[PDB]
Amino acid sequence: SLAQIKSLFATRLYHAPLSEHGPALDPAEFAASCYSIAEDDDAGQEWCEREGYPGYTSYASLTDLPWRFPIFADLVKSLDAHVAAFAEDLEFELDGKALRLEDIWINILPEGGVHGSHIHPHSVISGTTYVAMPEGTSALKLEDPRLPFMMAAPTRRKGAREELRTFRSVAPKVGDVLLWESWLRHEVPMNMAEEDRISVSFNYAW
Amino acid sequence: SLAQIKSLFATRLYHAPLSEHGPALDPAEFAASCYSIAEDDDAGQEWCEREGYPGYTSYASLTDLPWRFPIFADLVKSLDAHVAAFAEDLEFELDGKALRLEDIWINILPEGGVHGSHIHPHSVISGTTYVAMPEGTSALKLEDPRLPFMMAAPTRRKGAREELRTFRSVAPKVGDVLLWESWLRHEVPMNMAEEDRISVSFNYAW
Amino acid sequence: SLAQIKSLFATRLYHAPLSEHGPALDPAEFAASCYSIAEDDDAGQEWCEREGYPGYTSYASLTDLPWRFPIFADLVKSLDAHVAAFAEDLEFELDGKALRLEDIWINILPEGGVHGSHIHPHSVISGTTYVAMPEGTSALKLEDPRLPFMMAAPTRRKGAREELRTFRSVAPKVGDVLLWESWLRHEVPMNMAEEDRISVSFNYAW
Amino acid sequence: SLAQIKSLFATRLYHAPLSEHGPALDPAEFAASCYSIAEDDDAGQEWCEREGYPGYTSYASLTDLPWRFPIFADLVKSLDAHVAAFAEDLEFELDGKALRLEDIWINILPEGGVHGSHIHPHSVISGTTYVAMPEGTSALKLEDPRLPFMMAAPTRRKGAREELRTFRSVAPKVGDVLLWESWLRHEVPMNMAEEDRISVSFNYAW
């Protein structure tokens, strides 16, 4: 035999321009629409304040964005195709049943805003597209799903083989879309800029 | 931006001939020694029968194999170097402190023997070298550590990108050594041959 | 001292007489039936041999036991109601959408048979009903979902107090049903009784 | 009905008055001290700003609080004994080898401060002592180690019954110590009181 060391059980991170598919979205219309919706949403504004929610999110107040706003139906038609390419990369056996949009929402993170580590319970693919970035810094940090199984293990060198690293930081530009499997833990670092960081996040189910 | 999909958080499986390092072991002496030890070990033989242990294991009866048997000290001197190469691949930050042998034991799996899925609690590297194989079939199956986080996810196609597969089966030859991180779940498929499958398994701590 | 130690995030295991729900089911007939169907099932017997599976499962060979065998349709009427009571205990938000049977199979574990550690991927509630239990005969043995998080911890003394143990064994009587959440790992230790341990296992999805 | 639902594999959370162990420690002096050390700690203040950390931790800047500040040496004498009582409850096999302090740090969380979800990698017992708690002020909130195993399950109604919840909030009083196993995920929700929430957090290893 020959000595071999093999990579197994790898997580895949998908990172593309939104414009890789689906109809075109105007970035100016895109940002302005996010703002116009958030400003008309008294109920979501109050829930954020009561719940101690760092930014604005539309998640508790608005459940039907693509029904109500052509630009959001347009967005979901791109996202649909991005999720299809990704389900393909991930080798999902879908039968006759594509992944479909379960939830979709706006975030507006002002300066000083942060979102603590979490997963999206009961979804298959989750993701975020970036509507306005600030335009440093990292906007997403993904944590190794095996981290809590690694308690007895030495910490790892922060070396140049990215597949061995324990956290992965992502620094998207406006227009980019990120996708991942929903069980993956992820955090959103503090907005250090004075301008808002606007993004749209979403869950796809099977 | 360019569309990219990246592999993250990968498990590494190390698979080498034992003879890749350390002093040479005679395979005939190696097998015969395993047998001679197991046959003199009344206490381990009785514990196996009482505990409903599929084969013979020396694990409960003999804690000091390398102290008692030059061939086992020889083996540990090879294994020491195999574990060093692997800790290097895994990018462990070890300070001034190499991984050292914690436990080491013989298994003799007769026809019809199987070992159910398990991990090795409280170790860093675990592994097995193969002393006598039978010489079909698969002797080790490794399970994706993320399997139980994948309950809502479609099953995956059994395709040709091994890093996306949910189980990995390993079919070693005599003389091979396998190593993995101890939190990784692994099972030993039934010995379908009539001859015993003899192996030596071990845990390294930090 | 005002020191309090609270228990949180406990895994629930449901245990009831089968007869508390559903049509009357005679245990002597029930045993007789499982033996009878397993005898005719050459496919099953052969897949078992081929796949190195100890004893005897119908899981690969036969797929609609409830529709074919009236006594399995009665069993399933009972399971539904047991499952519903468990979901009530858990207390899942079900809409008006009751969990339904997804698979059900017969196991016959002879003297010396073991069934290795495993979960039931992609199910919500999993469970077993006990058909013939020699003359003890092997427990179902449950494993702590947290075990792989525990690698840095010291070992726990079988401080029993069956709350602080890594595994939990159950010796059910004939006629009992056990249910658990499908992510919960479990095995069947070696049947050391001369007679067969017969059981029927199943999964429920939403 | 003879139906039983048993609780297994429960996570333990220890809660006691700090004063039940160790030298006397005055809470007014204790508060005064934490404020005082945090004020001098420009390094800490600056790392915080730089690293987008809300409020104020000493964890990056100061590394031997017990040796430098007598009141922290007294605190630690107390923690040792609290930890030992918890290890006794757990009941780890410790040899004659008591778990010892590995790190300890001051947190000061102002109005609007949050501390994101996280574990304490590579520790055995982790915990917090409460120093100034406005005028409620944020709970410590604990997350079910099993959450990522639960992706196929329905959502659970805040059926409280603080046994079946995915998170568990604690509102401790000034002078309380809380301890948990270091793999347990937890966060601090937004401090909504105008005044600072001061606490001291620590890890113990074997």
Ligand SMILES: [Fe+3]
């Ligand atoms: Fe998220």
Ligand SMILES: [Fe+3]
């Ligand atoms: Fe093993």
Ligand SMILES: [Fe+3]
């Ligand atoms: Fe099972």
Ligand SMILES: [Fe+3]
């Ligand atoms: Fe903490």
